Design an enzyme around this catalytic site. Structure first.
Site, short mmCIF file in Angstrom:
data_model
loop_
_atom_site.label_atom_id
_atom_site.label_comp_id
_atom_site.label_asym_id
_atom_site.label_seq_id
_atom_site.Cartn_x
_atom_site.Cartn_y
_atom_site.Cartn_z
N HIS A 190 45.48 30.29 38.43
CA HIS A 190 44.20 29.59 38.52
C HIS A 190 44.44 28.15 38.08
O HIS A 190 45.22 27.93 37.15
CB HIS A 190 43.13 30.21 37.63
N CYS A 229 45.63 34.70 38.99
CA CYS A 229 44.65 33.95 38.19
C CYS A 229 45.23 33.55 36.82
O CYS A 229 46.15 32.74 36.80
CB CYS A 229 43.34 34.74 38.09
#
EC number: 3.1.2.-
Lengths: 186, 186
Positions: B124, B104
Site C-alpha cells: 500500500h 497491502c
C-alpha cells in the site's frame, strides 16, 4: 449517521457481502450484518464463515435503515427469496421510499418479493433469465444500475463499484471519492 | 490439488482476506484459513468477524503449502510481524522455495521476519516507508509485483489481481482466465 442493513444468508457470496460492509463502514455508515437464520455463524458460498452482528429478527427492531443490502450467491439469494421476513423488510423499505441495493443473484430476491417492478436493473449475466421472468423489469448491462431507489450490480468484480454507489447515494460524491482513494482501485 | 495457507490475525483487512480465499477456492485450490491466535473467531479491521478453519498451530502440522498468503490491514500485519510462529512458517516456506504472497501492509511482515531481501516488492502506498526501512527491497508501484517466489500487491482494490496472480502461479494462466470471467471484472 446513515444506517445500512446487510442481510446474510447461507450460501451468500462472501466477497459481495464483505466488500460492501467494509466500504460502507469506511464511509462512516453504521452497518448491521444481520443473519437471516439467527445469530449463528453463516457458511458462505466459498465456505468463508462470517459471524453476523445480530439476527435479522433483532436487527429489524432497530430499523428503519437508509439502505437494505442484498448480497448475491445463488443459494444465498434463493434463501433471501424464500424468506417471509425478508419480504416484509423489503416491502416496508419500498413503502417508506428507502433505498434497496442488490448485487449478482441478489436482485432475484426483488422479483420473488415483487419489489421495484418497472425498474431498470442489472444482475449477474447468468441470473438474467431468472430476473426477467415475466418481463417485470427492464434489463441493463451497466456494471452498476440505479433507477431511483433500486440499485443493482453484476458480480464480485463490480462489488467495489456497487459499494461506492451506495456510499454516494447516502453520503454524497465527495465522501465516496474520499473513501475510494485509499482502496487503490484501477 | 495445490494448497494455500492464509494467516488470519486480528485487525486483518477482511476484503484482502476474503477475496483471495474465495478466488483461490474457485480455482480448485485447497485453502486453509488459519487463525493466528487460535481457533476462535477473528475481528477484522472493519469489524467483520470471520471464523477460521483451524488454528495456525494445527494448520502448520498439515503443511507444507504451495503458497502462504499474508493479508494486509495495519494492525493485522503488525500481529503477523510480531509472531514467532509466522516467522518460522515464512522461513520454512522460503527455505523450501515455496511461494509467499502478501498484500497491502502484509508485506511489512516479510521485512519483520527478514524474508525475501533483495526482491522487488510493492505495498500500500502508506506502507512504503515502513517496508523500505533499511533499503532491503526495491520498491515497485505495479499493482501486483512478482519477483520469483515473492508476490506482493497494493490494497483492497488490487485484491482480485493479487488473487488471480496467485492462481496463475499455482494452476496456470488458463485456469486463472477461466476463474476470472464469471467475476465480472472490468
Amino acid at each position: 449517521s446513515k444506517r445500512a442493513l446487510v442481510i446474510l444468508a447461507k450460501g451468500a457470496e462472501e466477497m459481495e457481502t464483505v466488500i460492501p460492509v467494509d466500504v460502507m463502514r469506511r464511509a462512516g455508515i453504521k452497518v448491521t450484518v444481520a443473519g437471516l437464520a439467527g445469530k449463528d455463524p453463516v457458511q458462505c458460498s466459498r465456505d468463508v464463515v462470517i459471524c453476523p452482528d445480530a439476527s435479522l429478527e433483532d436487527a429489524k427492531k432497530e430499523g428503519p435503515y437508509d439502505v437494505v443490502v442484498l448480497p448475491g450467491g445463488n443459494l444465498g439469494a434463493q434463501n433471501l427469496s424464500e424468506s417471509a421476513a425478508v419480504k416484509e423488510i423489503l416491502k416496508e423499505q419500498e413503502n417508506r421510499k428507502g433505498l434497496i441495493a442488490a448485487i449478482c443473484a441478489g436482485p432475484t430476491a426483488l422479483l420473488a418479493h415483487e419489489i421495484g417492478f418497472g425498474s431498470k436493473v442489472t444482475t449477474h449475466p447468468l441470473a438474467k433469465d431468472k430476473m426477467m421472468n415475466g418481463g417485470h423489469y427492464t434489463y441493463s448491462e451497466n456494471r452498476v444500475e440505479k433507477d431511483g431507489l433500486i440499485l443493482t450490480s453484476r458480480g464480485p468484480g463490480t462489488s467495489f463499484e456497487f459499494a461506492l454507489a451506495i456510499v454516494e447515494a447516502l453520503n454524497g460524491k465527495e465522501v465516496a471519492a474520499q473513501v475510494k482513494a485509499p482502496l487503490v482501485l484501477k
